[PDB]
């Protein structure tokens, strides 16, 4: 059956769509690419990666960055509305995106290749609140990797927030002062972040506060052999603790 673009289906809603639109309206990709550096691209190049699957395309930032770097990218997302934005953003940068609508829990339904690398970036994995769904998603990613493939999966540093550290009592800024991100409510099973933009817009979003070692455990448990977790400093006013972690999980 064909996929229809809807502002409200099972994979996105108008609120989250408004949030990503607001981020993209105020934060240009050039600035974001400079602030994030070439860590992702360099990891892939040092591994000889050619074919990449983006499982969390969103409005397309990671996919377009990888296309610009010369990778063969397939751009998947659960949301058809997101994929339309991502395709047109790629078009605006002079690239033809290969979009596929797919749910992490059945990734090979319409994707039949295997990939040198998968990227699941922008703190996307934390959207899953059910442990069974987490294992299912990581198992689906594992199965889509070639024998010597690698999964790049990032997350916010929830350990520092759950342990009542400095980062739990303070907002974190991105793209200068364009947006602040504040952990309004934190418990073992839920973090609600307040995102306040420079134009006065406020969005409140829920995430599952994955501890760094719990994510590593899940990756090991679905079959990944070696995992290296890197501190990833993205925020404007850097602290002793990174605001993100990047897991580099090798299939074999
Ligand atoms: N279960 C699921 N299956 C497929 N896609 C999912 C999903 N849960 C969340 N997503 C997607 O994950 C994306 C997170 S947004 C992050 C987008 C991009 N990596 C960036 O950093 O800008 C959303 O577009 C959302 O639709």
Residue numbers in the entry: 12 to 263
Lines quoted from the article behind this entry:
Betaine biosynthesis is accomplished by three N-methylation steps in which glycine is sequentially converted to sarcosine, dimethylglycine and the final product betaine. Two dual-activity, SAM-dependent methyltransferases sharing an overlapping function are employed to carry out this three-step biosynthetic pathway as follows: MpGSMT adds the first and second methyl groups to glycine, and the sarcosine dimethylglycine N-methyltransferase (MpSDMT) catalyzes the second and third methylation events. Similar to other commonly exploited regulatory strategies, the control of betaine production is achieved by betaine-mediated feedback inhibition of MpGSMT, the first enzyme in the betaine biosynthetic pathway. Consistent with previous sequence-based prediction, our structural analysis validated that MpGSMT indeed belongs to the Class I methyltransferases, with a characteristic seven-stranded Rossmann-like α/β catalytic core responsible for substrate and cofactor binding.
To further test whether the functional switching of MpGSMT from the inactivated into active state requires a helix-to-loop transition of the H1 helix of the N-terminal region, we examined whether reducing the stability of the H1 helix could enhance MpGSMT activity by lowering the threshold of the conformational change. Four residues in the H1 helix (His21, Glu23, Glu24, Lys28) show a high propensity for helix formation and are not directly located in the active site. These residues were mutated to amino acids with considerably lower helical propensity (Gly, Thr, Asn and Ser, respectively) to give a tetramutated MpGSMT (MpGSMT4mut). It should be noted that none of the four mutation sites are conserved and all four were replaced by residues found in other members of the GSMT family or conserved in the GNMT family. Indeed, MpGSMT4mut was abundantly expressed and purified to homogeneity, and the crystal structure of MpGSMT4mut was essentially identical to the wild-type enzyme, except that the N-terminus of H1 helix prior to residue Glu25 underwent a helix-to-loop transition. Consistent with our assumption, the introduction of helix-destabilizing mutations increased the activity by 2.36-fold compared to wild-type MpGSMT, suggesting that the presence of the H1 helix may be indicative of the catalytically inactivated enzyme and that enzyme activation can be triggered by a conformational change involving the disruption of this helix.
